[model samples]
Target chain A: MATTYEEFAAKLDRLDAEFAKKMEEQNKRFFADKPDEATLSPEMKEHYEKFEKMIQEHTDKFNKKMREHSEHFKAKFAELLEQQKN
Target chain B: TYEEFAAKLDRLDAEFAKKMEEQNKRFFADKPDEATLSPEMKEHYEKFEKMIQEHTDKFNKKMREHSEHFKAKFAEL
Candidate 1:
């Protein structure tokens, strides 16, 4: 059978957990080494910091959307799973 | 609560899947059967492919994982 709510919820939770972890990692790296245009450059520390900040902002937005989407799907999907079981 | 939620998610999943598949198809189509695009163009194209794939893969994996997670949680409910 296709996955059930039993399967979906755990996965969604895990995805959220991992996504948060990834964001934290990015935050750490940004504060630490930093990057310039997706990489490191000698004279571009400020530039890289700005770029990373911008990208992180976008990424945060995207990740939030993704998590929300995941939750929305799981809830809907679980209701089906429950119905199918009944 | 009702079937509406189920239907909405089903539709959303199908829409997202279709869009990403079309994107990947177009990514490959741009090469004109390996006609060899310009170096810079190729680099950008590859990067584009990489970015899209990353997004789609993450999305797909999230769906799969979330589906499983929701199933278990609901069973308890």
Candidate 2:
């Protein structure tokens, strides 16, 4: 739908910012109060531990992938531009 | 190639969905009935939210990439 590169870039930025705001609001709803200091049940503790480990592992892998993909796209864009110029 | 990537994405999505559901069950298993919601309770809830939010962001990034991939292909063509 974007006819120009500037329009496309602007749309992407707007979408990113919108997502960021929505995410921030979603987080705020859960964290409005102080952190719960209540002692979790033993099972809850186990779940929390597992979640922490899983989150860390996924976070690392996904973040790396995101960076790599971003780089890939940027390169692809340049390639496209070059092809167009020829 | 795009189809292959999409398949890979579907698998990854299923994997994450399972994990997220598992965590959701665990978190809600011991759901509390609030009697005058306390600060401590609030904090834990927020912490859990933060964790889920981060996971969601990662998941969403993939979706965005899928779209971007096609968009770029069109631009190049």
Candidate 3:
């Protein structure tokens, strides 16, 4: 646990950076050497389209979860800060 | 194109990060340092950090597994 404000801030920054790096790396690996839609055969095109839809759905779900979590955290933090002021 | 899809994901991440930064700034503005916090407040802050990390890890793990499954399926296409 971080005992100082700076330590906590730095820890959060590091976590954010690590998360971003991993996300970028995952995306790079997923997209690497993948063919364009124009070059896909009909059967492969079908598969690609289905895959895109699945990815879109997954991404949307993740976005909603994150947004909800952020809102919850924000509210809780606000309450804590208010308590601290008293 | 795959590049276009990747670019779109990157943009989404960037936007999310920007929003988070703004929120953090608002939350921390004029806040006391951790060293001066009461024991309860310190514990709460630590728990908040842990919660964020856990959520992020869970999402990343799920995403990685999801991508692996799709990668194999796409490979055979």
Q: Which candidate wins on TM-score?
A: 3
CA deviation > 4 Å runs, candidate 1: A1-7, A34-46, B1-77
lDDT order, best first, reads 3, 1, 2
Residue B71, candidate 2: how far off, in angstroms? 32
Report how far residue B16 has shifted in candidate 2, in Å: 11
Model 2 TM-score (2 dp) = 0.34
Q: Record all residue pairs in model 2 with backbone atoms less than 3 Å apart, i.e. clashing.
A: A34-B43, A35-B43, A36-B40, A36-B43, A36-B44, A37-B40
In candidate 3, the residue pairs with backbone N, CA or C atoms under 3 Å apart (3 or more residues apart, or in different chains) clash, namely: none
The positional error of residue B8 in candidate 3, measured at the CA in angstroms, is 11
Q: What tier of docking accuracy does candidate 3 attain?
A: incorrect
By TM-score, is 2 or 3 better? 3
Question: Please, what are the lDDT tens digits per residue for candidate 1 over residues A1-86?
Answer: 35445665776578567756756674565456533355545545554444444444444654676666556556645553444344
Evaluated on the second chain alone, the candidates' TM-scores are: 0.60, 0.43, 0.57
Ranking of all candidate structures by their TM-score, best first? 3, 1, 2
The digit string of per-residue lDDT tens for model 3 on B1-77 reads 44455455555455555545554555546556867999988777767666656765565566556555655554555
Q: Which candidate is the best by DockQ?
A: 3
Q: Write the per-residue lDDT of candidate 3 for residues A18-83, one digit (tens) a residue.
A: 555665565456645568778889987776666666555555665566556555665655556566
